[PDB]
Curated annotation (Swiss-Prot):
Cross-referenced Gene3D superfamilies: Ribonuclease T2-like
Other notes: Has a remarkably high specificity toward CpU, ApU, and UpU.
GO biological process terms held by the UniProt record: RNA catabolic process
Keywords from the named record: Disulfide bond, Endonuclease, Hydrolase, Lyase, Nuclease, Signal
Reaction equations catalysed: a ribonucleotidyl-ribonucleotide-RNA + H2O = a 3'-end 3'-phospho-ribonucleotide-RNA + a 5'-end dephospho-ribonucleoside-RNA + H(+)
E.C. numbers: 4.6.1.19
Keyword Kinase assigned: no
Impact after mutating residue 125 to A: Slightly decreased thermostability (at 47-58 degrees Celsius)
Alphabetical list of InterPro entries matching this protein: Ribonuclease_T2_eukaryotic, RNase_T2-like, RNase_T2-like_sf, RNase_T2_His_AS_1, RNase_T2_His_AS_2
Protein name from the UniProt record: Ribonuclease MC
Disulfide bridge partners, by residue number: 15-23, 48-91, 151-184, 168-179
Organism: Momordica charantia
PROSITE patterns assigned to the protein according to its UniProt record, in alphabetical order: RNASE_T2_1, RNASE_T2_2
Phenotypic consequence of residue 102 to A: Decreased thermostability (at 47-58 degrees Celsius)
Length: 190
């Protein structure tokens, strides 16, 4: 792998697209971790042969993971962590064992506070329209590199909503680099 995509999701927006059934994320008001995805030549490496998910290797992080990496779609956090490890984590296991991988995600979340970076500049979430250039600009100023913005369009109103924010890192897992792919248009609700 040549880099990582550290993806955080905005729970309320993610769950807004679940028009039927329950969705735990509807009640969260901070960005949570979706995943840490190894990249290779501009694409996500997935399903690499590797070690099976082992909860005992991250037992010391259960408090932090339950708070920062909850399953926002269903009430089963462990299943989500297992799924992310098998689908993405195994692809960077050559350098980051399971324990180091989850610790890395936790540290990245604690050092990349999105709302904290936006709030002071009147760019915090309020259900109104925001500019893609503005949001990317504020994050670039605070963290030093451009983030990736991911949006989804509501089937009913055809309005675009910001759902995920990506922080791009080099293969060392600590050096931030510019992201290059957004799925958001010029404007979106946040
Ligand atoms: O909080 C979250 C956010 C996303 N997912 C995602 O929704 C799917 C549920 O089966 C999972 O795999 P998918 O890409 O492979 O199909 C996971 O990526 C969750 O489970 N929980």
């Amino acid at each position: 792998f040549d880099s990582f995509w550290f993806v955080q999701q905005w729970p309320p927006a993610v769950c807004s697209f679940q028009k039927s059934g329950s969705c735990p994320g509807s009640g969260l008001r901070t960005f949570t971790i979706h995943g840490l995805w190894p990249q290779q030549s501009g694409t996500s490496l997935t399903n690499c042969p590797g070690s099976p998910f082992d909860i005992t290797k991250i037992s010391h992080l259960q408090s932090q993971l339950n708070t920062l990496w909850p399953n926002v779609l269903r009430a089963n956090n462990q299943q989500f962590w297992s799924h992310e490890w098998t689908k993405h984590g195994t692809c960077s296991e050559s350098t980051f064992n399971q324990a180091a991988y989850f610790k890395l995600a936790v540290d990245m979340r604690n050092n990349y506070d999105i709302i904290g970076a936006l709030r002071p500049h009147a760019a915090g979430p309020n259900g109104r329209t925001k500019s893609r250039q503005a949001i990317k600009g504020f994050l670039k100023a605070k963290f030093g590199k451009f983030p990736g913005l991911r949006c989804r369009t509501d089937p009913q109103t055809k309005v675009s909503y910001l759902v995920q924010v990506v922080a791009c890192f080099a293969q060392d897992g600590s050096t931030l680099i510019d992201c290059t792919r957004d799925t958001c248009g010029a404007n979106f609700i946040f």
